[PDB]
């Protein structure tokens, strides 16, 4: 039977980038042709593989990561990028093999009063490893004196709210992102095009 890409793309609610979702897709036949011609996408960039070649390729597992970021931050979802999102939230490897698909979701994820449910990680001591997820909410220590779990001076809550509003500029508007990762191990492949 077909692979459930619709459950990821057509999902009624998306995850925050710091707690990005990942769907492991296995043991199915993937119909990439109908998937890529469904909705209209503002960003469609693939690395290490072509979108038309996926129908002829088989993989052991296929991963579909999904989250929400700002408009001006979609450029950080790519191999060899840096920034608050790529360093502290969602990081792609330098030899990433897959596709990044994003579309404007101002009509879904922005409220007139401001949608403060989508957060990103602002503070972190070090960068993330590729495909590393950090859902910690421990008070960040920016000074010598420890914080002991209470936010104060040099003691910051690590997560920051987006607050989307429908009339913002497109750089500040919410975008839903789907990243397709194609794992190729020395194991029998279960997902074919």
């Amino acid at each position: 039977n077909l692979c459930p890409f619709g459950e990821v793309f057509n999902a009624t609610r998306f995850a925050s980038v710091y707690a990005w979702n990942r769907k492991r897709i296995s043991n199915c036949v993937a119909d990439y042709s109908v998937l890529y011609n469904s909705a209209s996408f503002s960003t469609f960039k693939c690395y290490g593989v072509s979108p038309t070649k996926l129908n002829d390729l088989c993989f052991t597992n296929v991963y579909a990561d999904s989250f929400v970021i700002r408009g001006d931050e979609v450029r950080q979802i790519a191999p060899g990028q840096t920034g608050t999102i790529a360093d502290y939230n969602y990081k792609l490897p330098d030899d990433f093999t897959g596709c990044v698909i994003a579309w404007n979701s101002n009509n879904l994820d922005s409220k007139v009063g401001g949608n403060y449910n989508y957060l990103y990680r602002l503070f972190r001591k070090s960068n993330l490893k590729p495909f590393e997820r950090d859902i910690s909410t421990e008070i960040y220590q920016a000074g010598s004196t420890p914080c002991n779990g209470v936010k104060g001076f040099n003691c910051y809550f690590p997560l920051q709210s987006y607050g989307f509003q429908p009339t913002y500029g497109v750089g500040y508007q919410p975008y839903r992102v789907v990243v397709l990762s194609f794992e190729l191990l020395h194991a029998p492949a279960t997902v074919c095009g």
Partner: antibody
Amino acid sequence: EVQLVESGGGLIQPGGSLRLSCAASGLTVSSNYMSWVRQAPGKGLEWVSVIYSGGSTFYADSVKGRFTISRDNSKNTLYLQMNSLGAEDTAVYYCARGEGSPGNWFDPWGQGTLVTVSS
Amino acid sequence: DVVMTQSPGTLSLSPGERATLSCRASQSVPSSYLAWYQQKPGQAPRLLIYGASTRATGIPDRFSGSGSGTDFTLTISRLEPEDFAVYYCQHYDTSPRFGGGTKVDIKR
């Protein structure tokens, strides 16, 4: 007792290099967003560069390829290495914690040092 | 990338009056991304208001910010001779950006 003390300014010939220092007390430079903001005489404020706690660095287009921001954790000091200096670089250079974004504003600021580029 | 513009360039008001400084934008900018900085002569800029309206620590109550979208206003009610400074607005899109600044001269 939070202070950002700056040094390294002065005179430098066109094309020469300079290295400014920002010694911090009251915060850990390696654990913060640290930025450099310059101001040409009689003109407004311009963001120059920033370094993330995780190590990433970014620069304004007017200085990309010539400036290199760095830090020394043991000395708890921010640095700005300026190369290929010209008249457009003569300004008072400030260091500050933050990056001017929500939950991450420029605070506090250093006293600033004056770089004069002349022959 | 959003270009902000401050108006007027210079302001001349007697002590005790209400000062109104504007920072208009070409596009709509979130209020949470807007900040104000005060710079007195010979000193470093000081964070005045952040998040469009939230007052910084130790800043007198006579400083207040408001506005949303394309019109952000800094208000200095009950103006004082020590308020002589240049005030900048600041925001972030893809990089930190400052406005041209507004000079506040004080009549006497």
